[PDB]
Amino acid sequence: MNANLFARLFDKLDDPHKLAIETAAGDKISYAELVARAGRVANVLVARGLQVGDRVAAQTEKSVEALVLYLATVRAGGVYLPLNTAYTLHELDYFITDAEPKIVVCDPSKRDGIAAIAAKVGATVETLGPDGRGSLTDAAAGASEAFATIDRGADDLAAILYTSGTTGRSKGAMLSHDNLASNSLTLVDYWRFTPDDVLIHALPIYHTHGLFVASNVTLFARGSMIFLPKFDPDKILDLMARATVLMGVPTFYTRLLQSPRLTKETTGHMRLFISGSAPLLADTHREWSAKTGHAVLERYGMTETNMNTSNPYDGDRVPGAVGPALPGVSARVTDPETGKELPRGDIGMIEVKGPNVFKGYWRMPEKTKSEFRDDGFFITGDLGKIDERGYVHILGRGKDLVITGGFNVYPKEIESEIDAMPGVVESAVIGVPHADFGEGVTAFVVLKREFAPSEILAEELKAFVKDRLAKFKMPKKVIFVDDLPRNTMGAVQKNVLRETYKDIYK
């Protein structure tokens, strides 16, 4: 009855020699071998001073060795804290000071700098490079495989993951053993994962999608994964002939649609394509079906809540919707101000409750207090509606709402009209300070190669818009850009645009 996530995963192993992970080089690691690696590393953590409840902070390139570190930390009763690989030394300083880890694991090339940051909280530093070598690996080589998995309760912490930083400075989400186990167990059944599944794993592992959804679902299912260091469209296309599942973000799908190799024939061995972590546009969903004949299954989750909703595996997968609430999860829509539930179909604040919902923000009990309703529902910060069939539709983030001359403007519906114009790849709509209207609706528009940006084209876009947008929804300015700013996970970073273009109306 140990709730420890590692114990749930591995204490009963009825097929130990089954493949768990194939590495980028083609080496194959069984379940038993993965478990024994985790034992070695758990013993290393204890030898480097880990006590139960301590954080282990990890900034490394992706490798099976890094995945093992996650499993070992959890196994040893520690609290695993992965960190964006792209964070600079100064950026990293905040997270280490916030979390106060006992152990920091970093790239060998960053050791001297990170050791200084580590000294402030008295942390021991080990290294792990892109090839899986380093001081962590040296210590693990002579360590014992046997390890008594630490007894943990359902509500004890297994991880702290920092949010992506999209709306503001990243917050540390305290995730329990039951949060992670309950969610992945539900998804194994909901997505019909079996031991025959082979997951193409091309997502980073400092984020909930690549770390938990991809890994835990595969491991509970007793399937395997092909563990690639990054997204590479030609490698992914090659592997589909011998894999069954891809978990991706919308940009994976938009990129793959640009390959002339993406055909029915090339994808025909595949069981399931999943999209998550950012809005999969309805037109992309339809473009994928027209080109490949597969219907992408989209799901919606957050760092704080793991997965909340999912289009059904065996039901309608609806373009532009993120599906009903998962088994065990409750989802409702409420008036942002008052907090009362709205009728089905009305746009409001999405709130969720369930064993998937985290225990709070690390060392932010006030912020935590403000984001839970008295009845325990978590305020997502995402606006949307739930239709009559129970499917959640996400209209946009609350922070992205633009208030202009007295009117609420929802940037997704403007972006959709703009994106419909031939010549437009995609658009991002924000408000920036405006002396007349308070905030001015501003459209940032990425063009196809064949089109040149001009004031004339901007007017033609506005003319196109236009009959389909209420006067008050019309952008006060159109700005052509080479590319939208995105984070390492592919999510548009509207705060980047708000800062760069803050003075356009001055």
Ligand X SMILES: Nc1ncnc2c1ncn2[C@@H]1O[C@H](COP(=O)(O)OP(=O)(O)OP(=O)(O)O)[C@@H](O)[C@H]1O
SS3 312: coil
224 is in an annotated binding site: no
CA angle (256 as vertex; 252, 261 as ends), nearest 5: 155
Q: 346 labelled as ligand-binding?
A: no
Footprint of ligand X (CB under 6 A): 163-168, 170, 276-279, 298, 300-303, 322, 380, 382, 394, 397, 491
Nearest to 159 by CA among 72, 30, 39: 72
Is 6 or 253 the residue whose CB approaches ligand X more closely? 253
The interface partner of residue 13, options being Mg ion, ligand X, none and the CB cut-off 5 to 8 Å by kind, is none
Residue 361 carries which DSSP code? B
Find the shortest distance in angstroms from Cβ 278 to ligand X: 5
In the numeric block, which tokens belong to residue 476?
């006060």
Residue 322 contact partner, candidates ligand X, Mg ion, none, CB within 5 to 8 A by sort of partner: ligand X
Residue 123 gets the label, from left (phi > 0), alpha (psi -120 to 50) or beta, of beta
> How many Cα atoms within 13 Å fall on the side-chain side of residue 489?
25
Q: Give which of Mg ion, ligand X, none residue 397 binds (C-beta under 5 to 8 Å, depending on kind).
A: ligand X
- Span from 40-48, 161-169, 313-321, 468-476 in contact with Mg ion (CB under 5 A): 161-169
Stretch that binds Mg ion, among 97-105, 159-167, 246-254, 481-489 (CB under 5 A): 159-167
Looking at beta carbons only, is 254 or 303 nearer to ligand X?
303
CB of 400 to ligand X, least distance (A): 9
Please check if 299 is assigned to a binding site: yes
Greatest Cα pair distance in the chain: 71
**Residues in CB range of 383: below 8 A, 6 or more apart:** 336, 347, 348, 349, 350, 394, 395, 396, 397, 398, 401, 410
Partner whose binding site includes residue 382, from ligand X, Mg ion, none (CB under 5 to 8 Å by kind): ligand X
**Smallest separation (angstroms) from ligand X to the CB of 442:** 20
E strands of 229-387, at which residues? 245-248, 272-275, 297-302, 306-310, 330-334, 348-353, 378-386
166 annotated to bind ligand: yes
Could you say which of ligand X, Mg ion, none residue 113 binds, taking C-beta under 5 to 8 angstroms by partner kind?
A: none
Q: Is 167 annotated as a binding residue?
A: yes
Counting Cα atoms < 13 Å in the Cβ hemisphere of 224 gives 23
163 is in an annotated binding site: yes
- The tokens describing 164, both together, are 């992506």
Q: Based on CB atoms, which residue is closest to ligand X, 182 or 310? A: 310
Whether residue 265 is annotated as binding a ligand: the answer is no
Could you list the residues known to form a binding site for ATP, using ranges. 163-167, 207, 277, 298-299, 303, 382, 397
Q: Which residues bind Mg ion (CB under 5 A)?
A: 163
